[PDB]
Amino acid sequence: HPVVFRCLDKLGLTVQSVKWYVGADPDISGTGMSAKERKALQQVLNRPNSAMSGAQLRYAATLSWACFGRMAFKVSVMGDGSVNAIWPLGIPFLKQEFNKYGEVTTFQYGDEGNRESIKSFYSAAKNEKGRPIENYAFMIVKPSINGAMNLDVQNTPLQAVGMPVALYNGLMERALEQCDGTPNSKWFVTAGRDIGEVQSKEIKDGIDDTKPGGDSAGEIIFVFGEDVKLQEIKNDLSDIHSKIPLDDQARTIAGNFGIPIALLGFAAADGSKFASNYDESRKAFFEDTIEPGYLTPMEDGFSMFLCAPGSRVIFDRDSIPALKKSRADIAAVYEKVTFIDENEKREVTGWPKK
Amino acid sequence: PSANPAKIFIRRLFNSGIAKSVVSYSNVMAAARAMEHPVVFRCLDKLGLTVQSVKWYVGADPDISGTGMSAKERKALQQVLNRPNSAMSGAQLRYAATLSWACFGRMAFKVSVMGDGSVNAIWPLGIPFLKQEFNKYGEVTTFQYGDEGNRESIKSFYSAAKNEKGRPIENYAFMIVKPSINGAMNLDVQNTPLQAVGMPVALYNGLMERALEQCDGTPNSKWFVTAGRDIGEVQSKEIKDGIDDTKPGGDSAGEIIFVFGEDVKLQEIKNDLSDIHSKIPLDDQARTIAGNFGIPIALLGFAAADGSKFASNYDESRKAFFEDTIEPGYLTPMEDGFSMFLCAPGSRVIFDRDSIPALKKSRADIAAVYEKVTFIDENEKREVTGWPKK
Amino acid sequence: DTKPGGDSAGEIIFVFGEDVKLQEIKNDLSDIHSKIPLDDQARTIAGNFGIP
- The DSSP annotation for A72-130 comes to EEEEEE-TTS-EEEEEE--GGGEEEEE-SS--EEEEEEE-SS-EEEEEBTTTS-B-TTS
Pairing of strands A311-315, B20-21: unpaired
Cβ atoms of B264 and B225 closer than 8 Å: yes
Sign of CA dihedral A266, B177, B108, B166: positive
Cβ atoms of B177 and B106 closer than 8 Å: yes
Cα A52 from Cα A45, distance rounded (Å): 11
Cβ atoms of B318 and B362 closer than 8 Å: no
- Phi then psi for residue A136, to 5 deg, are -155, 175
Q: Is C12 on the interface with B (CB under 8 A)?
A: yes
Strand partners, A313: A22
User: Do B210 and C12 count as a contact with CB atoms less than 8 A apart?
Assistant: no
Cα B227 from Cα B83, distance rounded (Å): 80
Strand partners, B123: B110
Give how far A264 is from chain C: nearest CA, Å.
Answer: 21
Cα A48 from Cα A83, distance rounded (Å): 10
- Three-state SS for A22? strand
Size of interface B-C (CB pairs under 8 A): 15
Strand partners, A86: A75
Please provide the DSSP assignment of C10-21 as one string: T--EEEESS---
Sign of CA dihedral B336, B340, B341, B344: positive
Cα A323 from Cα B281, distance rounded (Å): 37
Pairing of strands B223-227, B265-268: antiparallel
At position A353, the amino acid (one-letter code) is K
Give how far B76 is from chain A: nearest CA, Å.
Answer: 25
| DSSP 8-state symbol, B168 | B
Residues 6+ apart with CB under 8 A from A117: A106, A107, A108, A109
Chain C residues touching residue A213 (CB < 8 angstroms):
none
Neighbours of C4 (CB within 10 A): 17
Cβ atoms of A106 and A123 closer than 8 Å: yes
Cβ atoms of A154 and A69 closer than 8 Å: yes
CA A67 to each of CA A4, A158, C26: distance values in angstroms, whole numbers, following the listed order = 10, 7, 40
- Phi then psi for residue B168, to 5 deg, are -65, 150
Cα A323 from Cα A317, distance rounded (Å): 9
Cβ atoms of A11 and A296 closer than 8 Å: no
Neighbours of B377 (CB within 10 A): 11
Give how far A228 is from chain B: nearest CA, Å.
Answer: 8
Cα B275 from Cα A239, distance rounded (Å): 12
Neighbours of B298 (CB within 10 A): 19
Cβ atoms of B214 and B208 closer than 8 Å: no
The gap from C-alpha B147 to its chain's centroid, in whole angstroms, comes to: 26
Cβ atoms of B388 and B382 closer than 8 Å: yes
Please compute, for residue A26, the number of CA atoms within 13 A of its CA located in the half-sphere on the CB side.
4
Q: Is A27 on the interface with C (CB under 8 A)?
A: no
Cβ atoms of A51 and B176 closer than 8 Å: no
H/E segment holding residue A312: strand A311-315
The dihedral formed by the CA atoms of A67, A69, A75 and A81, expressed in degrees to the nearest 10: 160
Cα A158 from Cα A176, distance rounded (Å): 26
In the sheet that holds C13-16, the strands lie side by side as A229-232, A187-191, C13-16
The gap from C-alpha B383 to its chain's centroid, in whole angstroms, comes to: 33
The angle that helices B25-34 and B90-104 make with each other, rounded to 10 degrees, is 120
Residues 6+ apart with CB under 8 A from A104: A96, A97, A98, A120, A122, A139, A150
- Phi then psi for residue B253, to 5 deg, are -60, 135
CA A270 to each of CA A273, B291, B310: distance values in angstroms, whole numbers, following the listed order = 6, 18, 9
What is the experimental resolution, given in Å to one decimal place? Answer: 3.2
CA A207 to each of CA A196, A215, B9, B221: distance values in angstroms, whole numbers, following the listed order = 17, 11, 67, 9
The angle that helices C35-49 and A243-256 make with each other, rounded to 10 degrees, is 20
- Three-state SS for B296? coil
CA A299 to each of CA A15, A21, A295: distance values in angstroms, whole numbers, following the listed order = 12, 10, 6
User: Do B219 and C4 count as a contact with CB atoms less than 8 A apart?
Assistant: no
Residues 6+ apart with CB under 8 A from A271: A262, B306, B309, B310
E strands in B147-279: 151-155, 172-177, 223-227, 265-268
| DSSP 8-state symbol, A158 | G
> Among the residues of chain A, which ranges form H helices?
4-16, 35-46, 54-68, 162-181, 199-208, 243-256, 261-264, 271-274, 278-285, 296-305, 324-334, 342-348
Neighbours of A185 (CB within 10 A): 21
The dihedral formed by the CA atoms of A336, A340, A342 and A347, expressed in degrees to the nearest 10: -100
| DSSP 8-state symbol, A137 | E
At position B299, the amino acid (one-letter code) is L
| DSSP 8-state symbol, B179 | -
Cα B11 from Cα B19, distance rounded (Å): 13
User: Do B220 and A217 count as a contact with CB atoms less than 8 A apart?
Assistant: yes
Of A184, A193, A234, the CB nearest to C2: A184
Count of positions (residues) in chain B: 390
Q: Is C12 on the interface with A (CB under 8 A)?
A: yes
Pairing of strands A104-110, A94-98: antiparallel
Cβ atoms of A249 and C29 closer than 8 Å: no
Strand partners, B4: none
Pairing of strands B223-227, A221-224: parallel
**Experimental technique behind these coordinates:** cryo-EM
- Phi then psi for residue A294, to 5 deg, are -120, -40
Q: Is B219 on the interface with C (CB under 8 A)?
A: yes
Chain C residues touching residue B214 (CB < 8 angstroms):
10
User: Do C9 and B206 count as a contact with CB atoms less than 8 A apart?
Assistant: no
Chain B residues touching residue A89 (CB < 8 angstroms):
5, 183
At position B157, the amino acid (one-letter code) is F
Cα B374 from Cα B381, distance rounded (Å): 10
Residue C40 burial (C-beta neighbours within 10 Å; 0-12, 13-18, 19+)? exposed
Cβ atoms of A3 and A284 closer than 8 Å: no
At position B97, the amino acid (one-letter code) is A
| DSSP 8-state symbol, A32 | P
User: Do A245 and C12 count as a contact with CB atoms less than 8 A apart?
Assistant: no
Cα A77 from Cα A308, distance rounded (Å): 14
Cα A126 from Cα A106, distance rounded (Å): 16
Q: Which of B189, B167, B195 is nearest to B177 (CA)?
A: B189
Give break positions in chain B: residue before each, C–N beyond 2.5 Å. Answer: none
Q: Is A114 on the interface with C (CB under 8 A)?
A: no
Cα C5 from Cα B388, distance rounded (Å): 63
